[PDB]
Structures are given as C-alpha cells and as structure tokens.
A paper describes a structure:
We have also determined the crystal structure of [name]-[name]-HK in the light state at 3.25 Å resolution. This full-length structure also shows a head-to-head, parallel scaffold from the N-terminal [name] domain to the C-terminal HK domain with a large surface area (10,240 Å2) buried at the dimer interface. Consistent with the light state of the [name] photoreceptors, the electron densities associated with the FMN chromophores are fused into the protein moiety in both [name] domains (right). The nonhydrolyzable ATP analogue AMP-PCP (ACP) was added to the crystallization buffer to stabilize the HK domain. Only one of the two CA subdomains could be modeled due to the weak electron density. As a result, the [name]-[name]-HK structure is a highly asymmetric dimer with an overall curvature of ∼150° pivoted around the [name] domain. Concomitantly, the [name] dimer in the full-length structure is rotated about 90° as if the helical spine were unwound, thereby placing the [name] and [name] domains from the same subunit on the same side of the dimer scaffold. In contrast to the dark [name]-[name] structure where the coiled coil interactions are mostly “in-register” or symmetric mediated by equivalent residues (Leu137A-Leu137B and Leu142A-Leu142B), the N-terminal half of the Jα helices engages new “off-register” or asymmetric interactions between residues shifted by one helical turn in the light [name]-[name]-HK structure. Second, as the helical spine enters the HK domain, one of the parallel DHp helices (DHp-A) becomes melted or deformed, while DHp-B retains its α-helical conformation. In accordance, the light structure of [name]-HK in the active state is highly asymmetric, where the ordered CA subdomain adopts an inactive form, while the disordered CA subdomain enables cis-autophosphorylation.
[name]-HK is a blue light photoreceptor from Brucella abortus, a pathogenic α-2-proteobacterium that can be transmitted from cattle to humans causing brucellosis. B. abortus [name]-HK comprises an N-terminal blue light-sensing [name] domain, a central [name] (Per-Arnt-Sim) domain of unknown function and a C-terminal HK domain. The [name] and [name] domains are connected through a long linker helix denoted the Jα helix, while the HK domain belongs to the HWE family. Upon blue light illumination, B. abortus [name]-HK photobleaches as a result of the adduct formation between its flavin mononucleotide (FMN) chromophore and an adjacent conserved cysteine residue as in other [name] proteins.
Numbering used by the authors:
A (entry chain B): 18 to 477
B (entry chain A): 18 to 330
The structure:
Amino acid sequence: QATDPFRAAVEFTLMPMLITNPHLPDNPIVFANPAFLKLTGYEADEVMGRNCRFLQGHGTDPAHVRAIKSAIAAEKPIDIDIINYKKSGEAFWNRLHISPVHNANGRLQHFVSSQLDVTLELSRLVELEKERKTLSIETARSKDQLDYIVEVANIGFWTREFYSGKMTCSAECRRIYGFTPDEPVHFDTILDLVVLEDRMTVVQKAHQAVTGEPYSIEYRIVTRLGETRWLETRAKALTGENPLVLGIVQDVTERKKAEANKALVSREIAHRFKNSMAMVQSIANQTLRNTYDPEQANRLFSERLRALSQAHDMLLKENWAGATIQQICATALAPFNSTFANRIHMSGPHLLVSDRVTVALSLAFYELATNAVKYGALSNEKGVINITWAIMEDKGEKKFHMRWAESRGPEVMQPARRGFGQRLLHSVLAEELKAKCDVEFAASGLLIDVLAPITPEVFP
Amino acid sequence: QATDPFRAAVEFTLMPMLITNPHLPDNPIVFANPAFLKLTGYEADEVMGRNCRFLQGHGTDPAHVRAIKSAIAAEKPIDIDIINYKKSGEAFWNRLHISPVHNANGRLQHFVSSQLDVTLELSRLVELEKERKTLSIETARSKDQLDYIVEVANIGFWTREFYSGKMTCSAECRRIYGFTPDEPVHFDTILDLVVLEDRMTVVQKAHQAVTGEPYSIEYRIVTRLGETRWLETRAKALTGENPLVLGIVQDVTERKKAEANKALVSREIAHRFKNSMAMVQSIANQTLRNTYDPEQANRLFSERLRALSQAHD
Ligand SMILES: Cc1cc2nc3c(=O)[nH]c(=O)nc-3n(C[C@H](O)[C@H](O)[C@H](O)COP(=O)(O)O)c2cc1C
Ligand SMILES: Cc1cc2nc3c(=O)[nH]c(=O)nc-3n(C[C@H](O)[C@H](O)[C@H](O)COP(=O)(O)O)c2cc1C
Ligand SMILES: Nc1ncnc2c1ncn2[C@@H]1O[C@H](COP(=O)(O)OP(=O)(O)CP(=O)(O)O)[C@@H](O)[C@H]1O
Ligand SMILES: [Cl-]
Ligand SMILES: [Cl-]
Ligand SMILES: [Cl-]
Ligand SMILES: [Mg+2]
C-alpha cells in the first residue's frame, strides 16, 4: 500500500546525497536527491548513469582523486574534501562522506555518500594560515633577539626536574661552568665545583625549591682548569605537571673582583689615618704640655709640623712608590744645611723604602738633627754629622745597616732623662723596619746603629 | 541477501534523521539514525516508541510548539527552529526540517525529519575566533619572555630600527645613560651625551651596522647630572623584513678609569687632608699662653679628632 519512508528521507532532506551501483560497470550514480542537484546545478538526468568523476576539472587536485579511487576499490569508507565545479562552472569545495553498502553475504553492492559545500572553510584556511604564519614569524624575530642577548652578555640557563632531578644546561651555562658542551649535568656535577665554604648554602637552596618561590643565590666555583668564578643565580619553580625549577646563572666575577678591591682602597686609607691622625697623638702629647714656655712650645710645634708635612710631599714625585734615602736625606736636612753648609755628610747607595717608613724617617731625621743642635755635634763651630748606610749580611740574610755618627762635637756626657726622641727611636723606628736599634753615648760623639731585615714592606 | 541502499544511506549519513508513524498512538519515533543518538546523546532503547516531544523542555517557546503541532495536524511540511535539550541538559537550538510521507493514494502514512543543530554550527564561527587569538597570544608571550629575561638579568638592551630610526631602551640601558624611565630615546639622546672626542667613532660604526657585521665600541658619556661614564656597546643587525639593530651596553667606568680612580683619589685624599689637618692643629696654636693647657687645650682639641674618625665610621 504505502511507500518506503527511507526514500522520503533522502528525497526530502536538504543534505546532498548520492547512491551508485558498483555492479553496474564503472560505478554510476543510480540515485541523486534534489539537494545534490541544487548543489551541483546540473539537471536530474545529467547526473544519472554517469560516474561522479565528471564534476572535476583543471583545478581539481589529481592527488585527492587518487585517494578516493583507492578506497573505492578497497571497499572501505572514506571522508575527504575535493574541488568540484557547479554546472555554471563556479568551483567549490565538496566534502564527501562516502560509505560502502554491504549485503548479507558480505559482498559489496552499493556506494552511498553525503555531499556538502564546505567552501566556507576555504576562507577559514586562508584567514587562519595567513595569520598564524605571520604570527609565528613575529615570534621568530623575538627568538633571535633573545638568542642574541644570550650569545652576548653570557646568560646561563638551567632547569631541574623537581621530582626526578633531570637537568638541562644551556651552552652559555655550560660555558660559565667548566663543562663540556654535551656532557650530562646533575646537581652532582655542579656542586662538585662549588667552593667548600659555599656548599651548604647551595644544598639548602636546591632542597628548598619546592615553594615555587623565586630565590637567588651567590656562590663561587673552581673550574676544571683551576679558574675561580663568582656566580649569581636567580630561580623560580614553575609548578604544574612535571615541576621544573627554572634558573638564570650569570657570571659576576669582574664585579666582585672589582668590588672587594675598591673597598680595599678605602680600607687601608682607614688604617693610614688612624695612624696619621694618631701620629700627631704624640706630636701634641709632648710639645704644648706643661711647659715653662707655652709661648715657645708653639714656636716648636709649628716647626715639628713644618717637617712632618715635608714627609708627605716626597711621595708626589713618585705615586706613593716610597722614596729614595738619597732624596729623604736631602728632604729633612736641607733646612739645616742653610746655616751649616757642608757640615752634614750623606753616604750610601741609591735605595728604596716603603712610604709608611719614609714618614717615620723624615721625622727621625729632623728630630735627631734638632738633638744635634741642642746637645750634640751640630752645636759648636766645627762639628760634623756622618750618615753612612750600606746593604750587607751577617746571619745569612741580606739585611740593612745605617749609622748616625756625630764627629768633632763637644764631649758627650750622660743623659739625665730619656725624652721624646729616645722612644721615638726605640719604639716607632724599630717597629717600622723590624729593626734592632742601638745607641751609645760615647764621649767622642753620638753613635747610633740600626739593623733591619729585608721584608719588602720596608724594602720594595 | 537484499539490503536496501536507502535504508543504508540514512543509516550512515551524519545528518540526524527521524521517521515517525502517525498511524500509531502519540505519533512516535520508529527510526532514528545514529546521527540522532549523537546529537542527543541518548541510547537506542531511549528514543524508540516515544514521541519526539520528549526532547522539549522548560525554555521552549510554546508558540513554536504550536505551529509544529499545527503543521503535523494539517499534513504540511515545516522548517522551524526550537529550543530542545540533550540528555545531559544542554540548552541548544534545534532546526526542525519536517516532511510528510503521502502514500500512493495521497494518504498520510509517515513523517520524516532531518534535524540540524544550529548551536554547533553557529558556534564554530566563535570556536576558532577563540583560536585566532590563542596564536596571537603565543606571539605576545614570546616578546614578553624576552622583556622578562632582560629584567631579571638586569641587561642594558637597545633596538634601533634601521630604516625608521625608532629605538627602544631597556630599563638598565636607561639607567646606564642618564635617562628617564620612559622618555623617548633616539640616536640624538645617546649622542648628545657622548664626549666631543668620541662622536665620530660612535657615528662611524652606527652607519657601519647596516651589513649585519657585529661590532664593539667603547666611548665616554657625560651623564645629565655631571657623572662621566665609560660604556662598551656590542651591537649587531638582524636582516629580516625591516632590519632591527640589536645592541647591548654595560657600564665599564671602572675597568677603564681604575688606574686613575685609585691614583687620583690618594691625589686628593692627601691633597685635602694634609691641607685639612695642617690647620685644625693650628688651633692648639690659639690656646697656649697660660699654664695647665694640657688640661683644657686638650678638651678643646680631642673633640675634633673623633669628630672626623666618626665622620667616616
Ligand atoms: C558515492 C560516491 C560519490 C562520489 N561523489 C563524488 C563527487 O561528488 N565528486 C567527485 O569529484 N568525486 C566523487 N566520487 C569519486 C568519483 O566517483 C571517482 O571515484 C573519483 O573521480 C576517483 O575515481 P576515478 O579515478 O576512477 O575517477 C564519488 C564516489 C562515490 C563512490
Ligand atoms: C518527523 C517528526 C519529527 C519531529 N521532531 C521533533 C524534534 O526533534 N524535536 C521536537 O521538539 N519536536 C519534534 N517533532 C514535534 C513533536 O513530536 C510534536 O509535534 C510536539 O510535541 C507538538 O505537538 P503536541 O502539542 O501534540 O505535543 C517532530 C515531529 C515529527 C512529525
Ligand atoms: N745628639 C745628642 N748628642 C748627645 N746627647 C744627646 C743628643 N741628643 C739627646 N741627647 C741626650 O738625651 C737626652 C734626651 O734625648 P731626647 O732628644 O730624646 O729628648 P730631649 O731632651 O731632646 C726633649 P725633645 O726630644 O722632645 O726635644 C738629652 O737631654 C741629651 O742629654
Ligand atoms: Cl642551584
Ligand atoms: Cl520502519
Ligand atoms: Cl649606537
Ligand atoms: Mg729631641
């Protein structure tokens, strides 16, 4: 009585469909629903008895055609897109969902398909690919930029799998350590380079990095070639699936090497000043004290400081490179040689002495000569002062020797005191040379002997 | 052995399809292609012998259900959209394409429908509109990771667009020069700090940067505040579409003038401390004329020697 409803499905549905017969020769379209003929534009008889192949053309990819024909003989289904041309020739994209109808025996008997004009994704490919290409070329620009800032500037780059301990070391990182460009790295291999003082800090931090919290370490290493390097390292664990700790490691040696030296400059200055400020600790200790002549004790102070400030300018012909005894023996004893012209004699080699001794020199020179004018040989008319110094030896060393000899003076009696010089000599002149100092009050003249081992804080 | 190619053509198509049986109570469903059990996620035994009504729900415009019930009654086709609900509960538009099946006399025997989801269709225009921006975010992610490394490693970085002359200056680069955190830098702002005796060298190899030939240069700048600084600039040229000149700069005013630093400091830490302590002790020159000044003229001097030893502690 009544028809088959499944034909009314394929007949009325707006989905273009097709049936073909692979027992008829060359698999011809036996059925074409009206939608397939609204899609293609051809007429009912024009698409019957022919093979679908007729929709292809010059732009139709002859590679897709192989893929379909392959599966048809395989008797397996196939989904694929291909170019087709409307009856008016207007090409479109045709998506084919092609399936093989088997019967009860298991032998093929029909092919069925569903066709769709998926020429909307054509503009979707042109949009998506044109953009996501120029955007992955935008990235390729900011790759080479980052890559270059790491060639230069030497930026190390390491990772540690927080769960397993797997490590990755970038080339600059391997360059910063003493590492072969391709040997395996673990926490192991790095810590074996950290100086023993700084190990427990590294361990405590590498076992701390569960917090996902950016830490920052400084630690020194000793490369496999004996070189020593300071390192800053900033890390920050990225929690997630495989928790990686990501770290930056850069070499900060030239900064550290130059920091801990620029402080050494102002370190000695803070030592050459609690010695020079406390140098006048003695110059004012004795001079303007409880004297019978506070008016003349500043006639003397301004004369013993006019000589200490002479012990500062000798270090200007040479950049504090000490001075020569040949120049200092002229520095402090040229004012005397005005009145006592050619009555003080200097004998010795052209030598060299550290600048923290050239100060205690031009004072002991100026002080002892002042003693010669008061009590000693530079007081009378025909007194003379003999200064001899020469490098010689006794107990195997190459030690230093000098003599203050006062000849043709007045007979030297004995001192009833032991004033400022007699300890300016034993205490801040012997402790300026590692010296063994001596004084004899011979009746003939003042005999002063000095003996100093060579330790280039005294003899450069 | 004689299977139907039509019974198999709907069997396999991806268009949801229904065939109902009006000559039965309630006009129930007696066929649903698997393309229907996907669209509604229901099992097989869950849509057979039950009216297509059961897909409707609480948000279904009833004036729609009226014209559908009306066309069914009058044996007409209908092409309408209606809000239906999946087995999950998803609120999705449903495009009903319904047709009558009139037998060989003109007598309503069957009803057929091809269902079309206009929620999976009308969303793919915004399912990859959210993909065009995932790939616009990976791009901005990589220009960021650059910016991120330049910060954490505190690196003085600069980029001169070779054609245009536009420049970008990293933070540390702007701190090395005497530069505002965000002032517009070009080549002038960097040259106006160069000392006269080094401008030619800066210029000579700033035009010699065209040929992708990496170059290093040292030169002095007098900062805006008066500080003099030595800088080593290592630069290059990436030749892509528009060539970017890549360059790094670091303050070396130390590895340079440290011979003079250590020297010309003692040349003034004694130049003005011999000069500076040779007169503060001329104050003991202005306290001595009476007696017992080693009792008060030292209470008027020892308060100046740790007034300078504490001015540096
Ligand atoms: C049911 C069915 C429908 C097909 N529909 C089309 C079609 O619409 N457009 C098309 O180019 N090819 C279609 N084909 C593929 C062609 O029929 C043919 O197989 C293709 O051109 C490759 O095979 P051939 O090299 O022997 O021609 C269809 C195939 C089958 C089995
Ligand atoms: C072939 C066919 C398919 C139908 N498919 C749906 C459907 O998918 N969703 C829906 O809400 N209604 C569908 N209907 C409509 C409902 O079954 C029915 O018309 C609705 O309940 C309104 O009639 P009523 O007031 O008697 O319930 C379909 C009707 C037919 C004849
Ligand atoms: N060149 C010399 N020749 C002989 N005797 C000397 C001498 N220099 C010092 N004396 C003797 O040693 C004593 C103390 O020597 P010293 O020079 O250290 O103190 P002083 O009396 O000169 C006070 P001040 O040293 O502060 O000027 C003198 O009084 C003197 O007897
Ligand atoms: Cl670490
Ligand atoms: Cl049936
Ligand atoms: Cl430049
Ligand atoms: Mg004396």
